[PDB]
Design an enzyme around this catalytic site. Structure first.
Site, PDB file in Angstrom:
ATOM      1  N   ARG A  12       0.825  -1.214   0.000  1.00  0.00           N
ATOM      2  CA  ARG A  12       0.000   0.000   0.000  1.00  0.00           C
ATOM      3  C   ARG A  12       0.862   1.269   0.000  1.00  0.00           C
ATOM      4  O   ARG A  12       0.659   2.175  -0.808  1.00  0.00           O
ATOM      5  CB  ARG A  12      -0.938   0.021   1.213  1.00  0.00           C
ATOM      6  CG  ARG A  12      -1.975  -1.115   1.245  1.00  0.00           C
ATOM      7  CD  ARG A  12      -2.716  -1.235  -0.070  1.00  0.00           C
ATOM      8  NE  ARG A  12      -3.571  -0.077  -0.331  1.00  0.00           N
ATOM      9  CZ  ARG A  12      -3.959   0.310  -1.542  1.00  0.00           C
ATOM     10  NH1 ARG A  12      -3.568  -0.368  -2.623  1.00  0.00           N
ATOM     11  NH2 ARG A  12      -4.734   1.377  -1.670  1.00  0.00           N
ATOM     12  N   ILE A  13       1.824   1.350   0.908  1.00  0.00           N
ATOM     13  CA  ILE A  13       2.669   2.533   0.923  1.00  0.00           C
ATOM     14  C   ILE A  13       3.678   2.462  -0.225  1.00  0.00           C
ATOM     15  O   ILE A  13       3.910   3.457  -0.927  1.00  0.00           O
ATOM     16  CB  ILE A  13       3.403   2.672   2.266  1.00  0.00           C
ATOM     17  CG1 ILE A  13       2.381   2.964   3.376  1.00  0.00           C
ATOM     18  CG2 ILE A  13       4.445   3.794   2.184  1.00  0.00           C
ATOM     19  CD1 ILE A  13       1.347   4.061   3.043  1.00  0.00           C
ATOM     20  N   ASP A  34      10.397  -6.922  -3.965  1.00  0.00           N
ATOM     21  CA  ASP A  34       9.299  -7.573  -3.265  1.00  0.00           C
ATOM     22  C   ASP A  34       9.304  -9.020  -3.745  1.00  0.00           C
ATOM     23  O   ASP A  34       8.937  -9.306  -4.885  1.00  0.00           O
ATOM     24  CB  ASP A  34       7.950  -6.913  -3.582  1.00  0.00           C
ATOM     25  CG  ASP A  34       6.906  -7.193  -2.511  1.00  0.00           C
ATOM     26  OD1 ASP A  34       6.769  -8.375  -2.114  1.00  0.00           O
ATOM     27  OD2 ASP A  34       6.222  -6.242  -2.057  1.00  0.00           O
ATOM     28  N   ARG A  81      14.414 -11.734  -0.524  1.00  0.00           N
ATOM     29  CA  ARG A  81      13.877 -11.604   0.829  1.00  0.00           C
ATOM     30  C   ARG A  81      14.799 -10.837   1.778  1.00  0.00           C
ATOM     31  O   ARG A  81      14.333 -10.018   2.568  1.00  0.00           O
ATOM     32  CB  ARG A  81      13.595 -12.979   1.438  1.00  0.00           C
ATOM     33  CG  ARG A  81      12.149 -13.427   1.367  1.00  0.00           C
ATOM     34  CD  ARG A  81      11.891 -14.507   2.411  1.00  0.00           C
ATOM     35  NE  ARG A  81      10.580 -15.137   2.275  1.00  0.00           N
ATOM     36  CZ  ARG A  81      10.206 -15.864   1.228  1.00  0.00           C
ATOM     37  NH1 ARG A  81      11.041 -16.053   0.214  1.00  0.00           N
ATOM     38  NH2 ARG A  81       8.999 -16.417   1.198  1.00  0.00           N
ATOM     39  N   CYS A 153       1.721   7.483   9.976  1.00  0.00           N
ATOM     40  CA  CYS A 153       0.793   8.416   9.356  1.00  0.00           C
ATOM     41  C   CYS A 153      -0.016   9.128  10.437  1.00  0.00           C
ATOM     42  O   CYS A 153      -0.400  10.280  10.273  1.00  0.00           O
ATOM     43  CB  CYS A 153      -0.156   7.683   8.416  1.00  0.00           C
ATOM     44  SG  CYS A 153      -1.106   6.407   9.232  1.00  0.00           S
ATOM     45  N   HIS A 180      -9.559   4.820  12.818  1.00  0.00           N
ATOM     46  CA  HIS A 180      -8.704   4.396  11.715  1.00  0.00           C
ATOM     47  C   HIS A 180      -9.273   3.346  10.768  1.00  0.00           C
ATOM     48  O   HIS A 180      -9.952   2.415  11.192  1.00  0.00           O
ATOM     49  CB  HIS A 180      -7.407   3.877  12.338  1.00  0.00           C
ATOM     50  CG  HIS A 180      -6.245   3.829  11.399  1.00  0.00           C
ATOM     51  ND1 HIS A 180      -6.223   3.034  10.274  1.00  0.00           N
ATOM     52  CD2 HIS A 180      -5.043   4.452  11.444  1.00  0.00           C
ATOM     53  CE1 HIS A 180      -5.057   3.168   9.669  1.00  0.00           C
ATOM     54  NE2 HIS A 180      -4.322   4.022  10.360  1.00  0.00           N
ATOM     55  N   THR A 183      -6.273  -2.008   7.851  1.00  0.00           N
ATOM     56  CA  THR A 183      -4.995  -2.113   7.146  1.00  0.00           C
ATOM     57  C   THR A 183      -4.594  -3.570   6.888  1.00  0.00           C
ATOM     58  O   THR A 183      -5.233  -4.513   7.380  1.00  0.00           O
ATOM     59  CB  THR A 183      -3.844  -1.430   7.919  1.00  0.00           C
ATOM     60  OG1 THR A 183      -3.653  -2.095   9.170  1.00  0.00           O
ATOM     61  CG2 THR A 183      -4.152   0.038   8.156  1.00  0.00           C
ATOM     62  N   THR A 212      -1.649   2.477  20.518  1.00  0.00           N
ATOM     63  CA  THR A 212      -0.812   3.155  19.541  1.00  0.00           C
ATOM     64  C   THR A 212       0.117   4.130  20.255  1.00  0.00           C
ATOM     65  O   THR A 212      -0.299   4.818  21.177  1.00  0.00           O
ATOM     66  CB  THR A 212      -1.641   3.966  18.525  1.00  0.00           C
ATOM     67  OG1 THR A 212      -0.746   4.690  17.670  1.00  0.00           O
ATOM     68  CG2 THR A 212      -2.548   4.964  19.238  1.00  0.00           C
ATOM     69  N   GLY A 213       1.369   4.192  19.821  1.00  0.00           N
ATOM     70  CA  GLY A 213       2.303   5.111  20.446  1.00  0.00           C
ATOM     71  C   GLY A 213       2.410   6.386  19.632  1.00  0.00           C
ATOM     72  O   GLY A 213       3.289   7.207  19.866  1.00  0.00           O
ATOM     73  N   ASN A 317      -4.480   8.053   5.290  1.00  0.00           N
ATOM     74  CA  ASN A 317      -3.295   7.341   5.785  1.00  0.00           C
ATOM     75  C   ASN A 317      -2.344   6.813   4.708  1.00  0.00           C
ATOM     76  O   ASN A 317      -1.129   6.755   4.915  1.00  0.00           O
ATOM     77  CB  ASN A 317      -3.691   6.206   6.747  1.00  0.00           C
ATOM     78  CG  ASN A 317      -4.886   5.402   6.267  1.00  0.00           C
ATOM     79  OD1 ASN A 317      -6.016   5.897   6.250  1.00  0.00           O
ATOM     80  ND2 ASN A 317      -4.646   4.154   5.888  1.00  0.00           N
TER      81      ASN A 317
HETATM   82  N1  LIG Z   1      -1.227   1.465   5.226  1.00  0.00           N
HETATM   83  C1  LIG Z   1      -1.091   2.641   5.836  1.00  0.00           C
HETATM   84  O1  LIG Z   1      -2.047   3.423   6.009  1.00  0.00           O
HETATM   85  C2  LIG Z   1       0.255   3.132   6.369  1.00  0.00           C
HETATM   86  C3  LIG Z   1       0.491   4.561   6.612  1.00  0.00           C
HETATM   87  C4  LIG Z   1       1.799   4.925   7.133  1.00  0.00           C
HETATM   88  C5  LIG Z   1       2.847   3.978   7.379  1.00  0.00           C
HETATM   89  N2  LIG Z   1       2.586   2.614   7.125  1.00  0.00           N
HETATM   90  C6  LIG Z   1       3.651   1.637   7.389  1.00  0.00           C
HETATM   91  O2  LIG Z   1       4.198   1.251   6.086  1.00  0.00           O
HETATM   92  C7  LIG Z   1       4.637  -0.109   6.152  1.00  0.00           C
HETATM   93  C8  LIG Z   1       3.953  -0.969   5.056  1.00  0.00           C
HETATM   94  O3  LIG Z   1       2.530  -0.773   5.236  1.00  0.00           O
HETATM   95  P1  LIG Z   1       1.531  -1.224   4.015  1.00  0.00           P
HETATM   96  O4  LIG Z   1       0.144  -0.920   4.436  1.00  0.00           O
HETATM   97  O5  LIG Z   1       1.982  -0.700   2.673  1.00  0.00           O
HETATM   98  O6  LIG Z   1       1.751  -2.792   4.001  1.00  0.00           O
HETATM   99  P2  LIG Z   1       1.472  -3.931   2.913  1.00  0.00           P
HETATM  100  O7  LIG Z   1       1.297  -5.164   3.601  1.00  0.00           O
HETATM  101  O8  LIG Z   1       0.426  -3.408   1.958  1.00  0.00           O
HETATM  102  O9  LIG Z   1       2.833  -3.905   2.030  1.00  0.00           O
HETATM  103  C9  LIG Z   1       4.025  -4.435   2.496  1.00  0.00           C
HETATM  104  C10 LIG Z   1       4.803  -5.062   1.289  1.00  0.00           C
HETATM  105  O10 LIG Z   1       6.045  -5.607   1.777  1.00  0.00           O
HETATM  106  C11 LIG Z   1       6.335  -6.764   0.939  1.00  0.00           C
HETATM  107  N3  LIG Z   1       7.365  -7.548   1.619  1.00  0.00           N
HETATM  108  C12 LIG Z   1       7.214  -8.471   2.651  1.00  0.00           C
HETATM  109  N4  LIG Z   1       8.408  -9.012   3.028  1.00  0.00           N
HETATM  110  C13 LIG Z   1       9.304  -8.430   2.235  1.00  0.00           C
HETATM  111  C14 LIG Z   1      10.752  -8.565   2.120  1.00  0.00           C
HETATM  112  N5  LIG Z   1      11.452  -9.414   2.909  1.00  0.00           N
HETATM  113  N6  LIG Z   1      11.363  -7.803   1.189  1.00  0.00           N
HETATM  114  C15 LIG Z   1      10.716  -6.941   0.374  1.00  0.00           C
HETATM  115  N7  LIG Z   1       9.341  -6.753   0.414  1.00  0.00           N
HETATM  116  C16 LIG Z   1       8.663  -7.469   1.308  1.00  0.00           C
HETATM  117  C17 LIG Z   1       4.964  -7.405   0.803  1.00  0.00           C
HETATM  118  O11 LIG Z   1       4.956  -8.483  -0.180  1.00  0.00           O
HETATM  119  C18 LIG Z   1       4.036  -6.244   0.605  1.00  0.00           C
HETATM  120  O12 LIG Z   1       3.741  -5.993  -0.767  1.00  0.00           O
HETATM  121  C19 LIG Z   1       4.364  -0.594   7.575  1.00  0.00           C
HETATM  122  O13 LIG Z   1       5.501  -0.535   8.448  1.00  0.00           O
HETATM  123  C20 LIG Z   1       3.240   0.329   8.018  1.00  0.00           C
HETATM  124  O14 LIG Z   1       3.069   0.382   9.452  1.00  0.00           O
HETATM  125  C21 LIG Z   1       1.297   2.219   6.628  1.00  0.00           C
END
Ligand SMILES: NC(=O)c1ccc[n+]([C@@H]2O[C@H](COP(=O)([O-])OP(=O)(O)OC[C@H]3O[C@@H](n4cnc5c(N)ncnc54)[C@H](O)[C@@H]3O)[C@@H](O)[C@H]2O)c1
Ligand SMILES: NC(=O)c1ccc[n+]([C@@H]2O[C@H](COP(=O)([O-])OP(=O)(O)OC[C@H]3O[C@@H](n4cnc5c(N)ncnc54)[C@H](O)[C@@H]3O)[C@@H](O)[C@H]2O)c1
Ligand SMILES: NC(=O)c1ccc[n+]([C@@H]2O[C@H](COP(=O)([O-])OP(=O)(O)OC[C@H]3O[C@@H](n4cnc5c(N)ncnc54)[C@H](O)[C@@H]3O)[C@@H](O)[C@H]2O)c1
Ligand SMILES: NC(=O)c1ccc[n+]([C@@H]2O[C@H](COP(=O)([O-])OP(=O)(O)OC[C@H]3O[C@@H](n4cnc5c(N)ncnc54)[C@H](O)[C@@H]3O)[C@@H](O)[C@H]2O)c1
Lengths: 336, 335, 336, 336
Positions: A12-13, A34, A81, A153, A180, A183, A212-213, A317
């Site tokens: 997502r991010i 990924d 990985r 976020c 929120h 997610t 949440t912190g 977010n």
């Molecule tokens: N979704 C939100 O609203 C939001 C907002 C701010 C910050 N974040 C933070 O951003 C981070 C990711 O959130 P997200 O919602 O995009 O998660 P997500 O699960 O959508 O995406 C995470 C990606 O990481 C990949 N991945 C897993 N293991 C891996 C590895 N070893 N190497 C490379 N890629 C790998 C996955 O296949 C996946 O596509 C988190 O730490 C989250 O807390 C999320």
């Protein structure tokens, strides 16, 4: 320019930071890693989005087993990985976005430096890498630091609001609640979630409280506020967009109008682009695609008295934060 | 042996009927709703999206104006104006005014024309005396024929605030309620003249809303008048809501001290009104809970010994419906 | 004199199969294995349920690290990854319900025999273990077969219906569509799903097309229908309860009333408890908790003519199936 | 010059028909009637939308209490219940889009004429007013007809598809099922709905069967298919975008690939803009904003044999349909 970046974790991010970079004039996405998404599958996940619509800015195509073309601009694709094995240097990736959610520690995220990356921006809070929130303390970044965090976020939403309130009226103490959206870490149906029991319950059929912190984290980016804020969250059945509900006790007495003027001016001044200000009857979807970190909802808030009020601020977010990840990279790149 | 009638066979009307029909001391004898025929009423009463199918007894029609719950007769009315409903004919002494359009004291009083003796408004009233069980129902006097049982939110907030105020003394508080959607909302963006935000698609939006529930606490707990207010966020759930109360208190108290005070209250006087839980529960675990306020020990958090955030759940439909019946029981015992 | 069973995989189906057993007069749950659910977490996951309500038929407690107490009755708990490492006989488990979703291959499911188990029932389709469906072909079971599949929840809904229609009117050809609730393999938000791309998209904010062999499997349990039926599925935003939409061309002309009559008769006869009959204006939530495998909705269907009709049957994909898992074990126990 | 239109019923269709007009080059929105939406409230409902995003095409001002300013173009606002009392003529509205959903009878919609309008296009099926579906029979329109119906969104998705399949392979008979998003007639919680009992149940927490004559209606716009098609619907928890599931027995044997080819061919020719063709792993939200009436999903469908197949076609029930209302008006104006 151009500022060359790589993305670890095309989720997502990860995918939204790619859209922001691809649409930028000063930032160039050169690589994506990924191991759970193939080059072929990558074009599909990037083109179609349930929340942010289809990508129509350029053409998406696969050059070969590990090279995407956005237009034709080329993007190397990795399926590794272990971060310490990603050859970032080969693709010229200077800055790496660590958005996997599993390498938030400074030591783990630093593994990217092995393959040739110069800087790493963790897309979440970190326990030992310094956190920076744009518009609040990004000017504390020094170039001798190679691994940083862009916070959460939620902190990016609350931090800007708290700074304005604090600078103008002084914050004695505050408690935050964030309604929120669901997610990736949540579940479609009741399933296992060892570290977050409530987090295991069916996401779109429950109001799910969580700790949440994010509010306490505000005290890290704004030391003067250390120990004056904390809060919690309620995850609810919506796909994107969240809202901050800040209950604060201020030192200098101020009418609600006064607080509204202070936020309005901030949104037009030093924090333009970071803090927004609305005065209409808007709902969550109306904020989808908003690039601000915190959009103050004037009509939604309510004051008990001149020193005790509840302030409301929205935030996409996924979208706002993704834009801040890029903005932080832009500032780090302009440092020195 | 308490005979009651219900005006407005909606979410609250139907559930209050379920409570009554399953009670030993209360008897539903009449139901009125101009938008639901006798036959349709049996379908709307039997099947429920959130509270399951009614199997307690067999449901059938006798005639067009009479339903039979297993073996007990229930007269059915389809009248528009309350002052035309012959409540006395059915022997209904108490009338649950649950239509949502007759909350004014004078408008509810219409039920008295048909021979009803008392009316309980299943909602806040601009002028009808308000009572919340476990909070001020003892202030009720038999000379009062028209009362308000307040809102489900106020029923959740009031009991909790009373316990914290009496133990610790609330100086000021602000509340937010994450609320399930209700019948006044729309499925897709539609017209809502009095509440624009509320006209937007209900299950696809977080929708801010104003609420008087916090301010109304002042009517049942005088010492809290002007000390509380708040708002609300309507979210995509079918039922069960939660109150988040942030308060500044006089007497310094650890979070553990606050928990035990509530726990004690839940096992004593307010047993059945206020509940206490210390497990990782979520919304659906509360569907069918009869309490007015269920304190979530683990969800709440304190900044310091004088400023804390308390969390309490409530099945806005089921708990309130039970309180409606409890108020009636109390009024009936009031000489 | 009870049938001692064990459960591998304490998920939606494993947990409900457990509720059924615990409240039965003839089956006794003596052990459960799930490396992702600790003993204390198990008591929480078993007690509370978003769809099927809280467990109140008995008290739940922890005797020891390793033993649960369900109404004064002990249930051994294991947390072992490899099936061939589970000491089932230690707990006295004769029958094992393989409900993890990752051991549907007859030779993988057979690993349970290693630990002393005698019979294994796979709670899902299997490429090489025979499939039995209550009301359709369970009597084909012979006691020398040690590994069986209870098929899918959809086949359990489709098979009985198809049987009645075929036995009475003769099915020439049919196509099925199941509007199915979301399940654990889906995602909360747009996430990786390499084997089912569509299935990766946000679950509760999309209609999602999906392939299924449920209609094709009918040929396995009902030979004369082999090759005459197939279909597809749409995943929609609901937590439980699904519906089968079967469009068939029949050999013997029949009015819709005659078709309704045949299904009613069956529901009151040989197929009582498997196929249900309804003629009211019901919706999905009215079937939560229904133990039948196929509830025919007489009013929802429509016939174009006497030889081409669209039939509708509901099924609580979780609860109905879980009850069938137990009914099959009961049948196997009675064989020879 | 510009085709001047008026809209009665500023709802989902009414407001999206307005966006289309306001973005065209040939259509001029001059008047809007909706007694439940005040002039000021109208700008808010028009500007923000939960599904189709914020209107950014042009600015929105309020010149006074009787008229709005859209991109400097004045739009009169009425608040009249009785259609016979709307002075359409005074505004210059030649064509009136009847989108209230309550005046679908020919005699009731005709009321718009007494006020000065020349043509009335009903945005729903009519029991007696001539029905037309662009790309299927819109040429059957003759200038002597002043009141017509643009059929339903479902018939608009199915008809074009059926026309293609029938012209190429011949449709012997067919049964349709539509998995449809919720609409304004449904309820948030279980409420009264005397003419549609099931439709009174909580919309976003249930799969709700519903009858529909959208399929039988194809025989109206496509005479040769009269009595050859019918079906029903399943309302599910999505905000917009529905899908047609058509099971058909065809005369000329054809492989799935030949059928795909015929549809792809029509989507690039005579029916371009009406019928679409996709061959990817899409989901409902991927069609939000699509202007076609019917989008064939190649990969979702399945054939049992060369003469019995299930075809899948998507449709943004709101957007696709709104665009067709403008198109029908265009054709009528072009055949005056
Ligand atoms: N979704 C939100 O609203 C939001 C907002 C701010 C910050 N974040 C933070 O951003 C981070 C990711 O959130 P997200 O919602 O995009 O998660 P997500 O699960 O959508 O995406 C995470 C990606 O990481 C990949 N991945 C897993 N293991 C891996 C590895 N070893 N190497 C490379 N890629 C790998 C996955 O296949 C996946 O596509 C988190 O730490 C989250 O807390 C999320
Ligand atoms: N649902 C909740 O969470 C909740 C909790 C506490 C209090 N309340 C209050 O209860 C009242 C009803 O709320 P609800 O959610 O049950 O609404 P609802 O719309 O489900 O039910 C109201 C019923 O009133 C009937 N009605 C309308 N006009 C009538 C008339 N003239 N005579 C007789 N019946 C008539 C309707 O046909 C409908 O069945 C409102 O005042 C509401 O604010 C609701
Ligand atoms: N949910 C339904 O509607 C439904 C109905 C019919 C059949 N099924 C089938 O039942 C199976 C499980 O489905 P579900 O919905 O209950 O899934 P689920 O994800 O809810 O549960 C699966 C459980 O397996 C456990 N598990 C994983 N690896 C394990 C291992 N090595 N050993 C022991 N336990 C392990 C998990 O921790 C989890 O609790 C699947 O094959 C599915 O196709 C599901
Ligand atoms: N996807 C869809 O929603 C869809 C697609 C195709 C056709 N339609 C048809 O379009 C029509 C409207 O559907 P909708 O979903 O836009 O409904 P809606 O409820 O969103 O809009 C209807 C509008 O009519 C207004 N209205 C009511 N009475 C009126 C009167 N007397 N005079 C003027 N305005 C009045 C309302 O205030 C409302 O804004 C229906 O006939 C429907 O069957 C809907």
């Amino acid at each position: 320019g151009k500022i060359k970046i790589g993305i670890n974790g095309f989720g997502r991010i990860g995918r939204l930071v790619a859209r922001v970079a691809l649409q930028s004039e000063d930032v160039e996405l050169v690589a994506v890693n990924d191991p759970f998404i193939t080059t072929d599958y990558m074009t599909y996940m990037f083109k179609y989005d349930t929340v942010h619509g289809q990508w129509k800015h350029s053409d998406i195509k696969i050059k070969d087993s590990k090279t995407l073309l956005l237009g034709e601009k080329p993007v190397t694709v990795f399926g590794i990985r272990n971060p310490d094995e990603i050859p970032w240097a080969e693709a010229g990736a200077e800055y790496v976005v660590e958005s996997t959610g599993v390498f938030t520690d400074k030591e783990k995220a630093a593994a990217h430096l092995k393959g040739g990356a110069k800087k790493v921006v963790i897309s979440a809070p970190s326990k030992d890498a310094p956190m920076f929130v744009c518009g609040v303390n990004e000017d504390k970044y020094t170039s001798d630091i190679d691994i940083v965090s862009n916070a959460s976020c939620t902190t990016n939403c609350l931090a800007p609001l708290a700074k304005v309130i604090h600078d103008n009226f002084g914050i004695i103490e505050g408690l935050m609640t964030t309604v929120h959206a669901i997610t990736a870490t949540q579940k479609t149906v009741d399933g296992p979630s060892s570290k977050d029991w409530r987090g295991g319950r069916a996401a779109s059929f429950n109001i799910i409280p969580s700790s949440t912190g994010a509010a306490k984290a505000v005290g890290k980016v704004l030391p003067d506020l250390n120990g004056k804020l904390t809060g919690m969250s309620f995850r609810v059945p919506t796909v994107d967009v969240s809202v901050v509900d800040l209950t604060v006790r201020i030192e200098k007495a101020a009418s609600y109008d006064a607080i509204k003027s202070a936020i309005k001016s901030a949104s037009e001044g030093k924090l333009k682009g970071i803090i927004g200000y609305v005065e209409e009857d808007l709902v969550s979807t109306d904020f989808v695609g908003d690039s601000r970190s915190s959009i103050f909802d004037a009509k939604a808030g309510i004051a008990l008295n001149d020193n005790f009020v509840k302030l409301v601020a929205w935030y996409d977010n996924e979208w706002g934060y993704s834009n801040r990840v890029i903005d932080l990279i832009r500032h780090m790149a302009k440092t020195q």
